[PDB]
Amino acid sequence: GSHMKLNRVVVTGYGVTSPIGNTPEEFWNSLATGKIGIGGITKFDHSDFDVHNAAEIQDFPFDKYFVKKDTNRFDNYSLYALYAAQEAVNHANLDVEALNRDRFGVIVASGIGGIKEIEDQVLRLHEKGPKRVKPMTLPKALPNMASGNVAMRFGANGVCKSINTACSSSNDAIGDAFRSIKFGFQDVMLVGGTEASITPFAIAGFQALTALSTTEDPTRASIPFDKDRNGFVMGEGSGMLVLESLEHAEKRGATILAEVVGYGNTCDAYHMTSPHPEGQGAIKAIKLALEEAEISPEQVAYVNAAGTSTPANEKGESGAIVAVLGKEVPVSSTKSFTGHLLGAAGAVEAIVTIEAMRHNFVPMTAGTSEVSDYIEANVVYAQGLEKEIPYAISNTFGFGGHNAVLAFKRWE
Template sequence: MTGNRVVITGYGVTSPIGHTPEDFWNSLYEGRIGIKPITKFDVSEIEVRNAGEIQDFPFEKYFVKKDTNRMDLYSLYALYAALEALEHAGLDMNQVNRDRTGVIVSSGIGGLQELEEQILRMGERGMKRIKPMFIPKALSNMGAGNIALKIGAQGVCKSVTTACASANDAIGEAFREIKYGHQDVILAGGSEATITQIGIGGFNALTALSTTEDPARAAIPFDKDRNGFVMGEGAGVLVIESLEHAQQRGARILAEIVGYGSNCDAYHMTTPTPDGSGAAKAIKLALEEAQLEPAAVGYVNAHGTSTQANEKGESQAIVAVLGKEVPVSSTKSFTGHLLGAAGAVEAIATIETMRHGFIPKTAGTRELSADIEANVIYGQGQEAAVHYALSNTFGFGGHNAVLAFKRWEGEG
């Protein structure tokens, strides 16, 4: 079945490098990283010093104080990005079929701040002092649920939880729902707010986080000195529509989704297949659905977490399927790793790359590791006409999710 063509007509973002698509892109273009010393709590007990914290979140634009009693920070981020995406897309919810308008917004962990606070509260004051809204605030589906409640979307509403692949899987699921005619419009993406004591402490216990003190050299994907990832936070939400629906309402089209590949390594809880074979299969699946030859791909937004095992395998996967010439960069070097939200903000970065004809550098990276054969762009960005691009995400549990995008040039 060929199905509907599926396009993106808007997006919203809140991130360590900007709270609008314009600011987000300008930071990537100009090389401004959002990784800084952690300010949310005391980290003197551990060696981790840096994170991609949200600075100056424009809370007052959509929220009032009592909203914090009903929503965890990750839900606030998700709802902000969704409302921004609607505005960016010029989509009036009073002009759509609400039964065919859905929300698929994921989170890898959900309301971690609320979990931390209420477990500590229980330990200090007893079970009866747990706050009534604890469960609704902590659930990982409530980012999607709160968006649907706010905008009145009555179609599909769910959250896909596949660790760091969650947002790509959300976008991929939305793509398929629209491609096969089940929905007309879906707000899809991811949100995460895990820069908390238990979040940082937990990943530190796993020895997964960078211990480099210099923020400019903490997130250095593919670099010979990489020693772990940097936690980030934020949200990205995309307005995804059938081409017919978008054209009927006269929408500005930003890009087309043409393929989605999803599979599992089935190898290890936290380590990817050493040879990158699982990731390579996901890339191939995305290309097959897009009916794309490998040579057509002009850019890969890599998962690129700044960890040894992940990037060796990803480089091998990219080279095995696409060759050594395709430009590759990791925008996690600017934002840190947003876990379940990573794929959404990186999808926006990928689309903006195609729209502006400019490949962002991998910030902080100075010298590639000897085991990296992929064509990693670092030092400075690169002008390039990109007609097709891939965005990779790979998560704990062996989850792989790859999206294929096409630059919109007004055809069709």
């Protein structure tokens, strides 16, 4: 027809693997008890770098679903996604053999895919020669393989792609899945993000950009909005969500955890590695999410800020939040706990926003003790506020001028 009927999109389950937990309970446990996951880099000899802290996953449940041989097949970035997606499926009680697999899609966002494999194989190539590049290199490295792997693991035949917008990647991944089910192209979506770039190269890259915090004290390294913030801390991990059409969830009596109601996407089109100091594009991004969500500024009870713990970020971000929502709405950045997961940021912060609602609890911004003079946003720190959160948003601002905002509605 000339028209397309809209559907409501709900979250029925989610999985996660991060520096602060490999299950929803552990994960949320860490947030509510203020237990951060930042510590000394153990993944490699950082003795020569300017950065010595990172949020690693040092207790990854490998045996649960994998066998040693799987390391010749997937890079950590893919392992994380697979695990997360499985947990999400187990959590959503989604029986994939009961699914209309053509309406079943997967979208796994990522900023740099298997950068570790790339680094390694590039050395092999230049040490031993072309004849020495492992055949499974590209299948492990290519940024889209996670999407395929997750799809291959659950027989999803629907829409399958990976989106890349740096730090905003998984926020855009969930948004596209949102729009997809909403306009009726798919019924179920496995969507989230994964990152595994705590490699010498990735760190060397961001350090050269001077974006990584050099603070030696793991507890003052990631302090979003704090006047002493000097860069973001690299984290690693993946977060997967299972989205379905309201109609589909009900038809199988699934347990709705929350609901996706808005998605804003804009581009600063200004600075190439930073967001507008005045959050010009971020503002519109928020307005767009709210517009789609048909709700107004006042109804927003919580904002999970990008809060990368960088001077420029928090300046622009607080600005835009105050411009649209105000100085009353609670603002916290959980990157203070998990570090910056980059392509996986959006996904994990969505789980934070969702659980926050399901617990009537606004998680704090760990480490933060003295907010910058100029930040007029109601930043939460020291400890977490208990509050009824009917509507909440989660922001992400990637390098390149990418802005993405997801709007959620607590389930009735």
